[PDB]
Ligand binder design. Structure first.
Ligand SMILES: Nc1ncnc2c1ncn2[C@@H]1O[C@H](COP(=O)(O)OP(=O)(O)OP(O)(O)=S)[C@@H](O)[C@H]1O
Ligand SMILES: Nc1ncnc2c1ncn2[C@@H]1O[C@H](COP(=O)(O)OP(=O)(O)OP(O)(O)=S)[C@@H](O)[C@H]1O
Ligand SMILES: [Mg+2]
Ligand SMILES: [Mg+2]
Lengths: 451, 451
């Protein structure tokens, strides 16, 4: 009912991802009735939109084994769109694409140990020659070169974000090998899928933050000013910083983070300077979101705070908040676990006049969180997350994350005598057999703690 | 059952130390079936691992009076490995060893009074010539030179940590004699063997600190992030600082110590600078442990603390704690005796989210502590430590150490009339007859005090 904004809605170009028959990195497959519906001729360059603001440029072909409302794509495309089989994507016509001037690609380190020879000659030139490949900045793609397969990252493009790779296109692969951990910490990046039992609130955040920035026309047309300060509150560990990260990674808006302790750690004046620099930066760049994490650090009750610099900072913030005129298109978000210790002046009309309660999850919410946490964990058949969800009454998201960590440590302990602290590497068999059992969860449960 | 991590595990190369028949400083003996099992030819340079991260480089020879699962080595090697007869050691092949360029040795002061002549000519040259001795940095070795025996320390080596001493190797013995007290305070250095009634907690520390740094692959494979802030707490004098010292000496990780009062003693800003320098240093150096001792000195509850500089430090620490990304491989340990006075922000998820209670010892634990303290004391037959353990209901390790000191002072008092405060030296006979009796302990017990 209120949750209406979160609903996906069926569109002509909103398609479910299926596994590819054509395993080329540049190709996506559609049924023939769907291509006619979208006015897409064979071999047209297309723009695909995934999760977490991710994109890929592909060339579209007709497939008969494919269903009407499905799209076929390999792992390389699915990775670049940060999607798994079954997820929905947008498909857009893309006749805009310029021919490429200069591109800069680099190999992922762990897929490139032993023999350089020439990376352009062995791998890249046979991959691109006469292929007229569409590529996007930040694409990770795989190329076989007889012997084995090397993954490459598109670092730069001379036509703005995406281009077609023609014979003209100078292919550079100059610098050091791109680190594996960097790109794995990039897949790590928090999206809305990584936040559990918070549906009602994510709906509220998209209403108050995402909707007025992307569509200011709506609010201006109806005759209403968009609320400009949203304050997330709730007990420690409920998911506020997580939502902050999600929003940062999910929004069309420019995002600026301010950490409370990070500001208060600075020299007198140099902190007030960074607060100003934040707001000037947000004003300068697009529709924008300013996220003040741990607000109570910077803005406690002026009445009960000893230092002059500390009182000056709260005043600096209040001024900035009223300093944005309507036409700035800047929303300030803030998170706290002690809302009652914030200066009431900041919670007045026009400032942080809207509150989102990120409270304690219910039994249903906890199950989501457990499913989110264990999505990379090796679990046994006998693990019942429904059972764990019910036995975890007072638990919030942080408590559940800890529970899963201790369940895993227990499984490591059960494998201890086949492991020693002294040897350089752990045995390969021991690594594979590692599964977290329900027994492990019950041991974690017996140790667990509220609030 | 949980304690599984502490268990030693039998290995082909894990051997018991027996007394040597071959009394050379460079030589270790093994049975012939064991040499074949480890693929060790006669006269191969080997690396031995002892207690408290200590090592020796030896040359291996076959012995027939030696058992299969035993190793023979003299006092000098045992000293260098900080092991006594019966302790287990690792043995490793070592064919890496370069020929030495320059070494720097120095004599131990008390073993060098009267006649210099030439230390290199009389002692060192005949010890090394055509012998191709393996030596490690930090080795203390004894050499006879007709008249008497002088102990020398290896201060420096031009091939990194260890080298072979060939005729090529320039032998320097330039500087001042190394002080006896320096090397006895180096034998003094704390290891896990010096910490009593803390088995459960030592196992926890190895799980949360040692395991994820030496084997990050386990936690990454199972799909779990390693906890990154461990907080030791308990009453005054239970052994927190003692464990701190033990870990520092026992770990494969680079270790950085921060003392609370040592930071708070510094000028405004220059304290925040050392904190950053500590974290930047730990990040720069390997897998690392940062130990913040007496954390309550640096991080009290921001709500109830007067100084602006004092509030700024807590903020500085929080920022550093969060500043470490997962892939830093740095664990922060901290100790306190008033956990309830630390800012709660620091005890949240991702910060100091794990706790180890170093509590009051039980009757069994007290016995361990008394055995650890008295290992260098001269005791009598009638001294029953089990009796003393039972009569010490409220006592913690610090109280037990003090109890032992006062028992010993009593034994000195019993010997008083044969001693006087005015004479330059104490009589030789009086020194040897000094034993701490049971009666002394009952006197110590009558004086003792709780908490
Ligand atoms: N609703 C949630 N869904 C999924 N994971 C969660 C959720 N809440 C917490 N977690 C996990 O717990 C961790 C810590 O939660 P945070 O987002 O830091 O809590 P917080 O609300 O910011 O707490 P405070 O107020 O800063 S102490 C996250 O990194 C997640 O792994
Ligand atoms: N569990 C123990 N095992 C062996 N010796 C101990 C133990 N606890 C205390 N001691 C002895 O008592 C001395 C003082 O203990 P510390 O390690 O300083 O205690 P602490 O827990 O650091 O106390 P705080 O919190 O700094 S007041 C040590 O040097 C040891 O000699
Ligand atoms: Mg938070
Ligand atoms: Mg201490």
């Amino acid at each position: 009912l209120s949750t209406a904004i979160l609903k996906q809605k069926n569109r002509p170009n909103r398609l479910i991802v299926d596994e590819a028959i054509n395993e080329d990195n540049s190709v996506v497959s559609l049924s023939q009735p769907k291509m006619d519906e979208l006015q897409l001729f064979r071999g047209d360059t297309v723009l695909l939109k995934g999760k977490k603001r991710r994109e890929a440029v592909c060339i579209v072909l007709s497939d008969d084994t494919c269903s009407d409302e499905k799209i076929r794509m390999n792992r390389v495309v699915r990775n670049n769109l940060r999607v798994g089989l079954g997820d929905v994507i947008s498909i857009q016509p893309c006749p805009d694409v310029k021919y490429g001037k200069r591109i800069h690609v680099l190999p992922i380190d762990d897929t490139v140990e032993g023999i350089t020879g020439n990376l352009f000659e062995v791998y890249l030139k046979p991959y691109f020659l006469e292929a007229y490949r569409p590529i996007r900045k930040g694409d990770i793609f795989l190329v076989r070169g007889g012997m084995r397969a090397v993954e490459f990252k598109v670092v730069e493009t001379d036509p703005s974000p995406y281009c077609i790779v023609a014979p003209d296109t100078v292919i550079h692969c100059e610098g050091e090998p791109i680190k594996r951990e960097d790109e794995e910490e990039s897949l790590n990046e928090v999206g809305y899928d990584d936040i559990g039992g918070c549906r009602k609130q994510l709906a509220q955040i998209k209403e108050m933050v995402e909707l007025p920035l992307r569509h200011p026309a709506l609010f201006k047309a109806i005759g209403v000013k968009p609320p400009r300060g949203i304050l997330l509150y709730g007990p420690p560990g409920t998911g506020k910083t997580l939502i902050a990260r999600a929003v940062a990674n999910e929004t069309g808006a420019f995002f600026f983070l301010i950490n409370g302790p990070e500001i208060m750690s600075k020299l007198a004046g140099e902190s007030e300077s960074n607060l100003r620099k934040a707001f000037e930066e947000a004003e300068k760049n697009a529709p924008a979101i300013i996220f003040i994490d741990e607000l109570d650090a910077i803005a406690p009750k002026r009445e009960k705070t000893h230092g002059e610099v500390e009182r000056r900072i709260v005043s600096q913030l209040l001024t900035l908040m009223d300093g944005l005129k309507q036409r700035a298109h800047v929303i300030v978000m803030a998170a706290t676990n002690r809302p009652n210790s914030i200066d009431p002046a900041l919670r007045r009309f026009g400032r942080f006049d809207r509150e989102v309660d990120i409270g304690i999850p219910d039994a249903t919410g906890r199950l989501e969180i457990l499913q989110i946490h264990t999505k990379n964990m090796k679990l046994a058949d006998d693990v019942d997350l429904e059972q764990v969800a019910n036995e975890t009454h007072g638990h919030v998201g942080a408590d559940l994350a800890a529970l899963c960590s201790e369940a895993a440590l227990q499984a490591i302990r059960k494998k201890m005598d086949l492991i020693d602290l002294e040897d350089e590497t752990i045995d390969a068999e021991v690594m594979n057999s590692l599964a977290v059992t329900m027994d492990d969860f019950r041991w974690a449960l017996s140790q667990s703690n509220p609030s």
